[PDB]
Design a protein around this ligand. Structure first.
Ligand SMILES: [Zn+2]
Length: 63
DNA sequence: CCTTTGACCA
DNA sequence: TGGTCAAAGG
C-alpha cells in the first residue's frame, strides 16, 4: 500500500470486462472521517493506474 | 494494527 | 449480476 499521505483499508475484489482486470476499493479510515478511493488499471497499459477520490477528509493531510 | 478472500438478495 | 462486510495471523 503506497503511502501518499493517508490511511486506506483495501476492500473487495471484482473483475471487469472490456478491461480484463480486477478492480479494488480502498476506504480511508479516521476517528471521525471516512472516504473511499478506487483503483483501476489500463487494459492497454498494466503499468498505468487510475485513482478516484470520493468524499472529503476532515483530519488534515497525514504522513 | 492491517489485509486477502467467498457469498447475499432480487 | 452488483457491491460490501467479516474471521483470523505476525
Ligand atoms: Zn480521511
Amino acid at each position: 500500500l503506497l503511502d501518499d499521505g493517508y490511511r486506506w483499508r483495501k476492500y473487495g475484489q471484482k473483475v471487469v470486462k472490456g478491461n480484463p482486470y480486477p478492480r479494488s476499493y480502498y476506504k480511508c479510515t479516521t476517528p471521525g472521517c471516512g472516504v473511499r478511493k478506487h483503483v483501476e488499471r489500463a487494459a492497454t497499459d498494466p503499468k498505468a493506474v487510475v485513482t478516484t477520490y470520493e468524499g472529503k477528509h476532515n483530519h488534515d493531510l497525514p504522513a
